[PDB]
Design a protein around this ligand. Sequence first.
Ligand SMILES: Nc1ncnc2c1ncn2[C@@H]1O[C@H](CSCC[C@H](N)C(=O)O)[C@@H](O)[C@H]1O
Ligand SMILES: Nc1ncnc2c1ncn2[C@@H]1O[C@H](CSCC[C@H](N)C(=O)O)[C@@H](O)[C@H]1O
Ligand SMILES: Nc1nc2cccc(O)c2[nH]1
Ligand SMILES: Nc1nc2cccc(O)c2[nH]1
Lengths: 268, 257
Amino acid sequence: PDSAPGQAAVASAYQRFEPRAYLRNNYAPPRGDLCNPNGVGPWKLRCLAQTFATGEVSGRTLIDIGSGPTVYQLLSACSHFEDITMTDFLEVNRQELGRWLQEEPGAFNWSMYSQHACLIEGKGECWQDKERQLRARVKRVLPIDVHQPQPLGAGSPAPLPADALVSAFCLEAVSPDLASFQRALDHITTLLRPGGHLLLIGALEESWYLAGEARLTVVPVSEEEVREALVRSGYKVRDLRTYIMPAHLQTGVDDVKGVFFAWAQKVG
Amino acid sequence: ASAYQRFEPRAYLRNNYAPPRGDLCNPNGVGPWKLRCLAQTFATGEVSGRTLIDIGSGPTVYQLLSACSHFEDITMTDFLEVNRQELGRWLQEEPGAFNWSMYSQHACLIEGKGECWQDKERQLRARVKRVLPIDVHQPQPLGAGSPAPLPADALVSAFCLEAVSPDLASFQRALDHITTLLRPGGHLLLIGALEESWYLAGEARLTVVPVSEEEVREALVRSGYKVRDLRTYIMPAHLQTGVDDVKGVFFAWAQKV
Ligand SMILES: Nc1ncnc2c1ncn2[C@@H]1O[C@H](CSCC[C@H](N)C(=O)O)[C@@H](O)[C@H]1O
Ligand SMILES: Nc1ncnc2c1ncn2[C@@H]1O[C@H](CSCC[C@H](N)C(=O)O)[C@@H](O)[C@H]1O
Ligand SMILES: Nc1nc2cccc(O)c2[nH]1
Ligand SMILES: Nc1nc2cccc(O)c2[nH]1
């Protein structure tokens, strides 16, 4: 059928996306409490840390797809990639990342995430060093639209193809349905070299979340749907794990039921 | 001694626990070295019990970071009221407290139990039952009817004895004095300046007895200790700051036998 109408709804909805509210809802406590090892924050960081710890995910260039105003997803990654591209649809998110890169006080504070990353990576690294490295390795912050066949546009800055991709809570949150999801997955997969790796994190069985005024629509997906989409896009699934959101982390900022983390290698 | 009546806790903290000496990023620094001696010792699981006393705490808490998870009853001490007030400010999370969070974080980092620094500080604050006045120069340093559970299962002291003793003999006696507080079989963890003769604390200028590693060893033996571990950290040039003339730092793990 027609993809344009659905995409236009999404783009419209995100014009009301408020980065601060979003940061507060997802990365401040209770969800942003990293003290409980059973929490979602620690689980995510652990998936990322353990994956990079295999040494199997490395190279020169990495691209973060739909970064938003967050950086936690790149904390463990930055030690393995000299060149990191961050990306987002919204200018206001790109600016938010701009505040953090300039180490402004106005910026969101990721230090609890940085510290927790250093802690689980087990190298005795101090968080200030972790943060300094990330800031050094982010070579550009780019506009992106995963719905376009060339999500970064034509003749764009990013070194292509990238050795690896990271994406957290993007696809399912900008895709009106499973078919749009699959197409978005196919588009970003063009940015990854063959043999490259994708690290994918997202909400399971979610239909909405709040970002200030904006109550945005999410395509509820299942683990098996995520798995099939990855296979469909030409990936071997190396790892796919599920975190079940505990009742007390269900706070009415969304209707998420769980979080998935996928490690996939693009067949080449 | 009367010199300690000019001792400024904020200036002391600033001089020794703010950068450069307070920068914990470089693993080769003295801060990380100290935390490591503490951490590694307790990790052995051989230094355990219910009660512990920190001798001459001053306005600092780093020395108990790893210790607090092995002892449910912790007593902190210092000769100066101003230091006891400063500790309380951090213990009660009052305003103007010193920020020990960099130290808490590195303790968690070093211990490697994936503990968050807020939990660490929470546990310490919880287990410190009391902050008592003390004079190591007295044969009963805590006094007659001290609220402190005696004898203690273990003792900790950092940069005290050598810093309040005019000379080696005085040093030795102060060690004998505190040793009476320690249950036989108990453990003492002792940290201090090596070959130091003075250090500043704002308007106060304190005299120190310059001691060597083997001098410390001998003193522990004489006091009735078996020396389990004794290590030295040589002070790098960039950590020589004009606030003292320390040459090194020692760590001793001693068991009362
Ligand atoms: N068409 C599109 N293509 C790529 N990203 C889009 C997009 N439309 C919206 N987005 C972005 O999708 C993001 C989802 S929120 C996820 C933020 C971040 N990655 C984290 O892990 O929390 C928002 O930043 C939003 O601006
Ligand atoms: N007669 C005495 N008996 C016990 N402590 C004394 C003392 N005279 C001075 N002190 C204290 O000894 C401390 C030395 S500085 C050490 C402070 C802290 N333990 C640290 O590791 O940094 C000061 O706090 C000082 O007030
Ligand atoms: N965007 C986003 N949605 C989430 C749902 C659960 C936990 C998280 O950290 C999330 N981040
Ligand atoms: N009192 C005191 N605390 C110290 C910490 C590190 C190095 C030193 O020389 C110190 N002296």
